[PDB]
């Protein structure tokens, strides 16, 4: 079963930390389309940027957006209609770069969680990958 991990990390107040989104046990038949949305508390962290990871062969297939008011970061992948590029192997899909609030306190732990309404994975235009398992992310504020 496809495993989707929001990475965990640590950083100090005011720093930029990197949260990779990793796919493990990707089905050999491949992912034709997906969306992935993470929620966060914007009083604790904000999105600074999102980078394509190494699974993205062509940037035209990958789109991203974030909203630092309501607290989410979204990513989409859409394979070309001729299936010339498809995600069929394991790796980093994307990396979210989060800015840790200036008022963050040592020992706080912030949660980066998968939004199930806006997250889905497809073999094809009609067939969903149904047994994906997700692991959410932790950002630990350190000194």
């Amino acid at each position: 079963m496809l495993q989707v991990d929001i990475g965990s990390t640590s950083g100090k107040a005011g720093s930029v930390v990197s949260v990779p989104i990793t796919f493990t046990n990707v089905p050999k038949s491949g992912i034709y389309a997906l969306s992935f949305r993470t929620n966060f508390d914007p009083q604790k962290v904000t999105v600074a940027s999102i980078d394509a990871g190494s699974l993205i062969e062509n940037a035209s297939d990958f789109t991203t957006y974030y909203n630092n008011e309501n607290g989410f970061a979204s990513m989409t992948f859409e394979a070309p209609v001729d299936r010339a590029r498809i995600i069929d192997s394991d790796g980093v899909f994307a990396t979210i770069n989060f800015k840790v609030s200036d008022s963050a306190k040592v020992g706080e732990l912030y949660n980066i969680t998968t939004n199930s309404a806006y997250t889905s994975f497809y073999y094809s235009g009609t067939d969903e990958i149904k047994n994906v398992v997700y692991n959410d992310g932790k950002i630990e504020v350190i000194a």
């Binding site: 389309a33 969306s35 949305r37 789109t63 957006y65 979204s74 989409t76 859409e78 209609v81 889905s120």
Partner: protein, 73 residues
């Protein structure tokens, strides 16, 4: 009953709805797997299904928009 963007009729606007529209525009498929799919698919509200429809459904999924152009004013 129907939801704008939901061309497969499962009740949710998702990335595969965008890709179905795109694959329809490109001639890869010839209809939607849903009796209200054509109605759901014309999200720019200009009377046909075109590449922009698929982009707008992707924008919904990304969270850039909540209302489709067909829904405003």
């Amino acid at each position: 009953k129907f939801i704008y963007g939901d061309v497969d009729g499962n009740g949710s606007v998702r990335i595969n709805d965008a890709v179905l529209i795109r694959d329809y525009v490109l001639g890869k498929i010839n209809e939607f797997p849903y009796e209200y799919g054509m109605l759901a698919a014309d999200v720019d509200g200009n009377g046909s299904i075109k590449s922009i429809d698929a982009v707008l459904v992707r924008d919904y999924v990304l969270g850039k928009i909540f209302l489709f152009p067909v829904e405003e004013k």
